[PDB]
Design a protein around this ligand. Sequence first.
Ligand SMILES: Nc1ncnc2c1nc(SCc1ccc(F)cc1)n2[C@@H]1O[C@@H]2CO[P@](=O)(S)O[C@H]2[C@H]1O
Ligand SMILES: Nc1ncnc2c1nc(SCc1ccc(F)cc1)n2[C@@H]1O[C@@H]2CO[P@](=O)(S)O[C@H]2[C@H]1O
Lengths: 150, 627
Amino acid sequence: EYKLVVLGSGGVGKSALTVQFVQGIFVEKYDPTIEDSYRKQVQCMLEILDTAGTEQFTAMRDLYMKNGQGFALVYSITAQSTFNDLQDLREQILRVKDTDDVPMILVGNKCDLEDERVVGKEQGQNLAFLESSAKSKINVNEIFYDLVRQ
Amino acid sequence: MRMILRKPPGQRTVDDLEIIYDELLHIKALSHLSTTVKRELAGVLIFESHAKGGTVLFNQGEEGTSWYIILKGSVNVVIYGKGVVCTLHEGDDFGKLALVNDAPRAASIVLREDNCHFLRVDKEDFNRILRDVEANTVRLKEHDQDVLVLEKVQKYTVMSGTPEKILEHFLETIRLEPSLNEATDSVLNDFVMMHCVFMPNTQLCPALVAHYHAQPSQGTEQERMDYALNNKRRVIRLVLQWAAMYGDLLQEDDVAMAFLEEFYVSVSDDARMMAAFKEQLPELEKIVRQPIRGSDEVLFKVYCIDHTYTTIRVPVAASVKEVISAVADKLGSGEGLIIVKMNSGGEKVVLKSNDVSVFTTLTINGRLFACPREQFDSLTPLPEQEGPTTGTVGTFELMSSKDLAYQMTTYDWELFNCVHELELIYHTFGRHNFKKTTANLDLFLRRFNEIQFWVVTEVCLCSQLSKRVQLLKKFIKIAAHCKEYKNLNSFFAIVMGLSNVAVSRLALTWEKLPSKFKKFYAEFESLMDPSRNHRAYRLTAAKLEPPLIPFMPLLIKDMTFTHEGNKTFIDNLVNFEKMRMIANTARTVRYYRSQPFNHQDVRSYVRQLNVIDNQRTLSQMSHRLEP
Ligand SMILES: Nc1ncnc2c1nc(SCc1ccc(F)cc1)n2[C@@H]1O[C@@H]2CO[P@](=O)(S)O[C@H]2[C@H]1O
Ligand SMILES: Nc1ncnc2c1nc(SCc1ccc(F)cc1)n2[C@@H]1O[C@@H]2CO[P@](=O)(S)O[C@H]2[C@H]1O
């Protein structure tokens, strides 16, 4: 039993990465109301706790942070503001569970589209760094692999 | 061979049956079936021949009594108002859909050429032999393209299709018999609710008029008269379901109001001229905290950088561009303004020109700003945003735990019933795609945060440790009463308020709380377990009977993931499977509100909460209460 959390601002691709990992878009219909909606056995069982659609309710992310063990700080490489929103979420993790060190990974989603890219690869490297793409299936599984190892 | 297949089922010999079976092995329409099934079909399959081109096999609207396979020649699929929609050839099969769904024929089948041979299986023979086994996808085609796709999910249900065909399908399958009033409405409900996504009123209303005036292209005078009359009865029925779904929201739509007013005129004129619609006409005559409407006007303050404000008077559903325009009018400017939301914590979001009805999407203490882009980084919060500096314990402590929870649930129900079902659809798919308000949903969702931060505010403003222990006790009791009243939303809001970092930090307060309430709260926290898709909550809500307020953030999550997890279109066709799932989640809300809910000073307090929503401020207050 493992519990991983996906964090970031809206329009980043959190939900797209979550579905694409647990089941996959299109190939099967996605029902988010059943028991195994966010659980995937990969050997170990992983539950993905995603803040997508509930960002306005800060209590939801805190509850997820409390129950979380691995964390994914995701941003869009086409959005300047989204990279700047990551600093606060990083701090908030080390407050709810009251710890010193926490297993986490930084994620740069939407790496497929370059003619709209305003955020380079360099910036995320200084702060685990991955340039993933939910729709192009790039590095989708890799994100959740690092967290179980840590 | 032909003679053998022309013989009645009960007149076929053992040797006849063997010869027929050997022939069935060469027919490709049957190749996916088992030996067992094909042996049974050998004594049931009827050979049918017709010599003349233009001979009618069956007509649109008739009962589905047979399933056909083409041995030789070709047939035209003919639909009223469309002509020959497509052609079927040697090896193709037709007529399954009406047979299995017990629905009328959606088309006529007419021979394309001279001398056509068919294999036929009649209804009762099809249902005992082929019903479960012959599970081929039903694909209705127009212009060599799929137009409707149906599968066994036992009837074939719509999986995908064009808006026009989906509408045609749901119109034709309406059963007008009074004993099926509930069953008919349930089938129609998905389309009626979800059409705004794939077939907006601008398209639907003209389609309804056209369908209402559609005339059959086949049959005797009486037969044609009867079909057209029942067709009209079906359209009226759909219009009634359509109008009921909108309710008061029709006033927001000029096209829909114009359609309905003219539709009533049409139906009333036809009723008096044909002596028909005696039950439906009076029903149609009826239609021709209070919920906020998109056309309602608001006096809204939009702030300048120096903290002066412009008061604008615009519709609730106004776009950001319309807001910018209204601001620019009163300030007398034409110098590139942008609209930005600002938190009490200084967090800023630039609103897009496209966004509609933003007034109610602000955080509890959020404010709206208008500034040139150069000013964005220099903006700073207003004092009025930072919340109260003194508590209100001296007021609500004198109020009963039961009285507070009851007045909360009462107020919550007024807000919950103000939310229209369609607002859930608009919120999920994006307000800009509809240019509609979700103001009622917005304010009800903000209520969850208001209650949460009320808890944190009062605790953090309570200097005396002894009285602070009395607060934790009281909030736990208010939560318990809320849970009893089936207000699970406000219940989780208080619990999460107690779970807040600034409140959970106060060890000296929690320690001094009696173990009776320590265990009560720990039980509440376990109900919040996100494990197995919030199984603890889901089972709790499932056990409860109708009049209940659900955990709203999880409802918004379900909807979000239904939309993002599923494509709206599959092969350029409407993914109706997705439409059903969204509709089911909205019907869950309808179920929760299907039954009604059963001290002015307590009412006044509960409805006028003044709250801190700045987390930094709350943490700082907490750190000086208990270092
Ligand atoms: N079973 C049918 N269901 C619907 N339409 C039929 C059907 N059969 C026909 S053909 C009528 C006909 C047959 C033989 C003949 F010598 C003269 C006329 N039609 C004609 O084919 C036309 C195709 O275009 P529409 O505007 S739907 O009108 C249709 C009818 O006039
Ligand atoms: N657009 C349509 N609307 C209504 N009916 C259509 C339609 N298209 C068809 S046949 C489609 C098809 C065409 C070529 C092919 F190889 C396989 C299938 N049909 C066939 O015509 C029958 C009319 O009676 P049903 O019991 S509703 O079953 C229908 C289908 O088998």
